Amino acid sequence: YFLWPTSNLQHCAAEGRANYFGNLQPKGQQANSLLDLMTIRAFHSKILRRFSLGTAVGFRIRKGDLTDIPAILVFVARKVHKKWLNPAQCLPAILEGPGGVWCDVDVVEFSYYGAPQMFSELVDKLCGSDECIGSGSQVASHETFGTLGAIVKRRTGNKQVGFLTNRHVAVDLDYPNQKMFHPLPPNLGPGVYLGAVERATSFITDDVWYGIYAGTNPETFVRADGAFIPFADDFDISTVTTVVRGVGDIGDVKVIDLQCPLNSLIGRQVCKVGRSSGHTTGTVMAYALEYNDEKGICFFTDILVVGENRQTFDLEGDSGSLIILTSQDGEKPRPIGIIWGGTANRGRLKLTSDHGPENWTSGVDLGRLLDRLELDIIITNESLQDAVQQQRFAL
Amino acid sequence: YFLWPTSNLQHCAAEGRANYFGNLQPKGQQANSLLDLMTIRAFHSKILRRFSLGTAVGFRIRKGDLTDIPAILVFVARKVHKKWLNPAQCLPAILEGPGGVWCDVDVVEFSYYGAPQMFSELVDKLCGSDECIGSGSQVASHETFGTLGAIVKRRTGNKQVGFLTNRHVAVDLDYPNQKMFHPLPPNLGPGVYLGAVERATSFITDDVWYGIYAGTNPETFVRADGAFIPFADDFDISTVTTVVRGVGDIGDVKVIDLQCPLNSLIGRQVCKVGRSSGHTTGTVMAYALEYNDEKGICFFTDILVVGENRQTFDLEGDSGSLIILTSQDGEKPRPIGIIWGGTANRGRLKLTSDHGPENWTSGVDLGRLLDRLELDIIITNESLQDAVQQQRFAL
Amino acid sequence: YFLWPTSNLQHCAAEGRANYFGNLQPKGQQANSLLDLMTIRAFHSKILRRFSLGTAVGFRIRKGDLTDIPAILVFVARKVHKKWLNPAQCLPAILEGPGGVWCDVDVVEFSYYGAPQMFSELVDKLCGSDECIGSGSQVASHETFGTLGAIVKRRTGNKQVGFLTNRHVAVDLDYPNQKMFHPLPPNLGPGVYLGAVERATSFITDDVWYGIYAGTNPETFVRADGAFIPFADDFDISTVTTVVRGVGDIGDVKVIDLQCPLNSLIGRQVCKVGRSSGHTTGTVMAYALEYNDEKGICFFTDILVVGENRQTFDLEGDSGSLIILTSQDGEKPRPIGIIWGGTANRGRLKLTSDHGPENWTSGVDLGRLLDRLELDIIITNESLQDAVQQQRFAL
């Protein structure tokens, strides 16, 4: 059955966060890493939640393009000239963090969709005409279908070989078992029972997820929704491929480090292979999107992606897809995130004038998600067989 | 008033069909005519109705294009790889009929629309700005409007001169008389009395329509919906034209023979002149579409048309249009069918990947429809005057 | 296939009606029969259609109760005082027919419902818990279910034994055969195949139906919608009962004669054994309800019934029920009509103040309906066996 932290171990966690912010209450060093940006945002969250639709961290967008400027991205429903703004409502272009670390502030017109289609040979193969199951393939529950993220393997225990996808796609907490079928469930069409979810994460506190206190709100949670489905005993493991169709072979997970310079993650081009839209390319415009609900709980999603060439990055049903960094200097592409599914997982964002608002996509940090679920992504078909061999004699 | 066959004369037809099937229960001769394809389909209908949305006969579609291979087309809601198919679900690629006659089996992704717009000079003329009434012109009842099929003439009796159109467009069996008006009825706009329906066909059994037993179901009916509207006495017959605008003069009806080779009908380019779509071109992809309803009665529609150049072939309101075979070797075009109207008259079909599923149109065999209604199409304006002369002194 | 009268035989029928009204264009004899009332209404229809929602013939309703006064009932959407009426719009209280025959005029506030539930032991028995099939029992098509009217028998030919019900309940002119099942069709629940409709009437002209010209409109039709369903060979005829549950044994059809005094039909209490309402009682408030549609065709329904005790007389699904005259002087009750089904078959009517407007029910003259369908109602279970015996050796 289900468990939640009690009143104890939460006030102790709340005092550990309040103490961190209490004690630490431009000619300084400019913020250069994600850690500094999140620290400044957390230490100025009270003035940033006043008239904003959300906050994030990334490079400033000026005249529609990234400017390689460390900043906190403040999201507003409608952005007007400061001549028509109240002096209180006007956001400051400079924010000072503890120790003199500072950054700029970006104002972006922003919106959400709410609760979450095209046609190609690749899309049809992923939807069921292919001879192999791999990253990008359709996965379906009895009511919801999405995209297969990656072929993973449990680190400890039985070391089962399975696949990772979005929790909302794979798991419905109104049903006893979360069975998964590739093309469709038996009630909706042809399909083969891939397996059932055996572990899934829904919400992780920011201190456990990032390792720091991303906000002053004691009720701060990350939207890391990932479900691990181990392949069934009767399922044909010979039909599982580790090649991500549309991009090819991939590398190990590129863990996003909060100490690294922002250019290592923000602004880097990404690719994706999903069920609905197939292969699409985009750019990581922001990180650690901070959303504050009307009920007083701070929500975090890791990656913000805007589709390149003004096209969209994902459609409905693309959730649970790998967000893979493209080949930087000719090396293997490396996944960095899974496409988050759920309410307000996508929306409209305003980068450039002379054209309509852009579509933005939220993502979940893949390295931290696998660390929390204790899974290893299988990137080689030879290593896939070894992991199956390692699982056969382990039981 | 209305009549239906009683319990007698329906059983006598029931064992008449059953006897034909009971007694007759690859190194043989391959099927080459529509008769052989329908025979094989009828003798294997039990294993083809299991997991299909319907069945037709035509040339196999491989890679999205016709492959001049005699085959039985099995329509499925979603076509997946046989790796994800149960062995029972998987269809056989070869079917054996009585006497060794055999054919291939083609699996097509299929869907239906249900219960059933563009702008050009031709469309405007057909909708009411033209000086003449002919094939393709708009015809309207008090609630439903459609397309005038062709100018026809009764073979026997009064030899009345009128026009043929779809039964659903012209006839509503909740109203005393089925009055018809060209542009619109008086309650919806300007118009003149074309006349009223005096005879209309709704359903003909397969043994009477095709001359053979197209299926093992005793309740097998052909959806041949054609209504004959003789022109009124006060209607100006001088404004009726036999020229099909958009294609010109036409020839007599090309009767579809079940003995002839499949290439004479299947895969041959067709043209149509209706309303809300004007002149369009398409290809006959299948014949004798067998649809089985949830209530245990087999339904048949003759022609299956997919619009050429990936464009649609008809829209709503095109029902009752001539399906005319285009000029084969420079001779006059000849009509082969009328566009059927009614529930699931059109739908969506999947030939090629890399683009969306295509629209398909159903049609009713024109030669057999006229044989059942005892009408002759007037193809020459000189013959139209003679037919009016023959009708004037006959009364 | 379907047939309709052509241009000929309709102008000849139109001239036979125009001649009747042309040649014949208070101190006289007051109207006393239905014939006189319909004659006066037909000869004054032009001034009665001006600002009325319909017309009928019956006894005048003053202060909410019948007054035993011959009159033409003029139906209005809203009835106001003549002080607020235009002098042209005000209806005349006296109408003069040919030969000096005259009647009063009644203004009744009227409305219609449009396109067409309680619980008792009798209702449950009729809906399927009973051991017998009879008048009032449920009959269901594949999409529509209604009430079994009466057990009938064809006069000529095979002399098949079956039952009569509403055409709209039993007949759908979009389907090949109109199969009937008592409780429910197989796709909706348990049931036995009662048989299929073999003959059904939809519209009969007034000259054929009543024997006179009920109106000046050449396009005048009666709404007689009755369908005869002969019982199947495999159907268990031993389970058919001729007893109308809730009223008992009945007599032969009481044909409504246009020469008789109005008290013989108008104002006489009626009973009905249908379904979704069970046994209900009402009063025949009007006869020959004349409705004029927006398209210029005059429609007629025979019987107008208002439920007694201010309760409703029928609900949706009661269509096809016997309208039976109650025991006048202790003799057997006799059916006079079938409950008509179809658009605007029921509606809301205003008799009395101090309470809401009442519900009215339309009916179809049963004697004329059986004359047109050539059926005899079986009223005795002994006669039912004889009719089955007479049908067994006749084939």
Next chain:
Amino acid sequence: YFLWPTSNLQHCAAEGRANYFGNLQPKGQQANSLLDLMTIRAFHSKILRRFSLGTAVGFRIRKGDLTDIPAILVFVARKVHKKWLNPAQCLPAILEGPGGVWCDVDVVEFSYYGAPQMFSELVDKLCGSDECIGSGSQVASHETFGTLGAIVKRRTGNKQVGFLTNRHVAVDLDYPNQKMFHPLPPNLGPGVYLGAVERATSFITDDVWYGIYAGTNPETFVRADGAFIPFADDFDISTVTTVVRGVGDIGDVKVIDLQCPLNSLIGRQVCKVGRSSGHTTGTVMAYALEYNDEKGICFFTDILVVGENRQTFDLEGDSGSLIILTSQDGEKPRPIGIIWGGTANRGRLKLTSDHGPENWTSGVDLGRLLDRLELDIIITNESLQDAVQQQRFAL
């Protein structure tokens, strides 16, 4: 995070159930306990799932009243006479279990509502006008509100004092923490923080819940949805009352034993205190309602309640209420179940004719729910203080 049983330990349970059924494949002893009824139902489930909406065990209902006859209740959408039934469709009146144990079969017309208001002084007190919190009081999450079941206490560990309610009311598995507020959440109205859910059950397999194999389906689950909310540290515990308003003091949980005679549970009058409808009385008409979904998994809910005096037993929002057995022989009332919330938690049922179908309510066995959640109901206000005293010094 969430966990589910893997492929192992489920096949081991699957063959454990299969072995029990394979080896054991009226002049015998009649069934007299719930165990025997469920055994016979499990051994005949294949022939009972054919044409039924579900199955339960209890006393036979004949003429609308319980007949103190051990029987298996088979629920049908519509119950008709066997004359209109297919002989295959007709259910047998006698069922034989292993060892000769037998029972009757009762057919009931059944329906379900789907996804789930009165005005009295008691209702207002429960909804928020009262000075104390107890059984029947309103409890609200941020989106769903329901009824407080009972004041409970953890058996082991911290021994926290809290309350039990429905899982669907208290827990939403799309939100980080399941906060609970009595009158309304802060976003919907006044109210204070009662606490948050720290443990909740959703589905328990039948072998763990009942201790037996209630069905042949390997995927058999009991819909036991209960959530425990420990009262907050800052919450005023002095305002919690153990008196169930409308019935008074209660006793300990009466555990339903599968060995005891059927009269101890089935047919016994019950009472309930819910926010929506206040105090209502009903009768336990069936036990262990077996519902089979379209996806092949068997669902079980424990108690079936029909409101007494033909009134309804609960309304929407009454979920999470105590189902309390009324005073049998003057002793203290004892709770036996919690009102289940969720899809198809209630519905409509047909006992008696001459009136509308009755409303039925599903319930969850309280004793087994507390055994699975390890909670003890506090029935005395003096014991409530001691439980709070025991919790204060334990930390």
